[PDB]
Amino acid sequence: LQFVSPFAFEAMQKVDVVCLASLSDPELRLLLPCLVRMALCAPADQSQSWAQDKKLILRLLSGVEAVNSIVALLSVDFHALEQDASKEQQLRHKLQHGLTLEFEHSDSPRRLRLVLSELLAIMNKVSESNGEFFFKSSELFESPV
């Protein structure tokens, strides 16, 4: 496994577009979702310097199809996902294939729902564990591919 380099993290924290251009391919592959969120989403700042920063973010965002994957993931309806999550949380308070296979074959909304369900189940399991450490195994999160 490759961890995020401190040079990449300080470049992200200092939002220096020339530094982000200087970083190479795999760390940008690791740092895709926030950068594409920057380049696609409605900017809070409307300054012209930030506009040049955004076009350089596009310049470095050249070459990735996971950009389009994140585009679809953003196109999934978050309000419906959120209210379904809330109802499932209330129910929890009151698949022949494996999880990795369902994540792969199922489309982006089902992927979001399944990872959300796993995270919420682990959170509830910790909250009922009350500080007692356990181990939770998921093939989706333990599949190195």
């Binding site: 391919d25 076009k55 596009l58 310049r59 965002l61 050249s62 070459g63 990735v64 199809e65 950009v67 389009n68 698949l95 022949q96 294939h97 494996g98 990795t100 296979l101 792969e104 074959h105 093939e139 599949s143 591919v145």
Partner: protein
């Protein structure tokens, strides 16, 4: 209810001690008692059973038990109302029913019922104290363990409770204990070595016969096709122990079998299933190399099924394909895998030329599957291997011939022309580096498709230049409809400028 739930363990102990007649009768006639000695031999006391891993059967039988409980509640309420009207003249409700908690339906051979938690506790205490699963392991006839075999954790703890049954005369049980094994540790290692020598005699030795060889390798293949990754790893580990340096057992040792073709047909089918279900890229590479070297080409149905399965591998597992053929690390193994897939699909295409019906420009007519056609064209995007190029060039001339039109498509059922090149595939064509694929994508593009292809990333600069030229052509043809399809003029304007440093359409955007 108390008499019924306390009556189950006595009959359980009697059937466990006499499995020949009473145990078989409980296995066949009483589903609840059948489940009960299944629980005591699995040592996993859960409703639904751990033996049945099929979720829809679990939910179906749970709904059946819920309906049976509701019907029992209604019948008990009606009978208690009749008794109360006879004796005390009182109305019986759900909150005023004693027979609801004191009585249950007497259907032992009907649907299975939910065991009480204290009943499960005393059943598990009896099993731990009396080793009933160990008694069933000593019980050669009938072998309900092998009946269930025809799942790894309950097998593991059942064997650990039954160390003394390490052989068990069925060879399927021999390999089952081999996959379990894959002072006391030294004795287990020595007995595992003896069992490995016995299986090496049963597969490669003079006593290697077809029935036991097929049983051994079919058990390995079915536990490979089992959905658990630990089961897959244990099965391939056992296969390597009996027999890509980590897959040389499959590539080299397996073809050296005496009964190699007769097991290789079933092996090809089960490894097609394992290509459908597998996740590991190197194991998939080994499977593809083995199938390219060893698939029976003779059967048309088997060859078409093989091509469809590899097509599902190409399309549905595009992420695993990307890990296999990442441009960062071009490997000789990936080169050989690409050459093998090109050879397989080229042989398939030769077999047709010598579901959708496609007719060639040369006059050849056959009915393929559009997923298979997309698999060949995706291999065309994956590009020329470093070793062989003849198969690549032949397939490229077959689907994308020079200065003559493509083989046209029709539906099998309705004979209507179908879109052989979808928009995502044309996007793949444009992001690919092959000029023929790029131009073939470039012909017949809608302006909205042009906009989407320009918006998408991962595409070379020359394809950006060609897309810009085609967008300028669309401007010169119909600027009004393209401008109507344009949503954010400034966004696509900045996009066009960025691709420019990476004209007429840019002028239209600025206007």
């Amino acid at each position: 209810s108390t008499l019924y739930w306390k009556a189950w363990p006595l009959l359980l102990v009697v059937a466990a001690f006499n499995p020949e007649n009473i145990g078989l009768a409980a296995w066949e006639e009483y589903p609840t008692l059948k489940m009960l000695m299944e629980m005591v031999m699995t040592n996993n006391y859960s409703y639904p059973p751990c033996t049945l891993t099929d979720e829809e059967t679990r939910t179906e039988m749970l709904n059946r038990e819920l309906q049976t409980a509701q019907r029992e509640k209604q019948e008990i309420l009606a009978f208690e109302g009749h008794l109360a009207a006879a004796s005390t003249k009182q109305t019986i409700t759900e909150s005023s029913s004693l027979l609801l908690s004191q009585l249950t339906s007497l259907d032992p051979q009907g649907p299975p019922r939910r065991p009480p938690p204290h009943i499960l506790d005393q059943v598990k205490s009896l099993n731990q104290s009396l080793r009933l699963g160990h008694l069933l392991c000593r019980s050669r006839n009938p072998d309900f363990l092998l009946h269930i075999i025809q799942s790894m954790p309950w097998l593991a703890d059942l064997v650990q409770s039954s160390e003394g049954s390490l052989d068990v005369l069925p060879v399927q049980c021999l390999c089952e204990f081999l996959l379990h094994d894959a002072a006391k540790k030294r004795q287990r290692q020595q007995k595992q070595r003896q069992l490995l020598g016995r299986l090496q005699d049963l597969l490669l030795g003079p006593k290697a016969d077809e029935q036991t060889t097929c049983e051994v390798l079919d058990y390995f293949l079915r536990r490979l096709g089992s959905s658990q990754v630990a089961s897959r790893v244990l099965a391939m580990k056992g296969l390597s122990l009996v027999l890509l340096q980590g897959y040389q057992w499959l590539l080299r040792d397996l073809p050296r079998l005496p009964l190699f073709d007769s097991v290789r047909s079933t092996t090809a089918l089960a490894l097609q299933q394992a290509i459908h279900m597998e996740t590991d890229p190197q194991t998939i590479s080994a499977y593809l190399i083995y199938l390219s070297q060893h698939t029976p080409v003779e059967e048309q149905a088997q060859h078409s099924d093989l091509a469809l399965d590899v097509a599902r591998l190409v399309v549905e597992r595009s992420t695993i394909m990307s890990h296999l053929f990442s441009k960062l690390s071009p490997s000789a193994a990936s080169d050989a895998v690409l050459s093998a897939l090109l050879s397989i699909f080229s042989r398939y295409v030769r077999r047709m030329r010598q579901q959708v019906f496609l007719r060639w420009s040369s006059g050849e007519t056959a009915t393929m599957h559009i997923l298979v056609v997309h698999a060949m064209v995706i291999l065309l995007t994956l590009g020329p291997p470093r070793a062989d190029d003849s198969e690549f060039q032949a397939l490229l001339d077959i689907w994308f011939p020079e200065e003559k039109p493509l083989p046209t498509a029709f539906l099998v059922d309705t004979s209507e022309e179908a879109l052989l090149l979808p928009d995502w595939l044309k996007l793949r064509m444009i992001r690919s580096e092959v000029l023929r694929l790029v131009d073939a994508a470039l012909q017949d593009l809608e302006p909205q498709q042009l906009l989407l292809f320009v918006q998408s990333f991962g595409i070379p600069v020359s394809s950006m230049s060609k897309l810009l030229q085609f967008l300028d052509q669309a401007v010169a043809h119909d600027p009004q409809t393209l401008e109507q399809n344009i949503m954010d003029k400034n966004y696509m304007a900045h996009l066009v400028e960025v691709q420019h440093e990476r004209q007429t359409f840019h002028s239209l955007l600025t206007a």
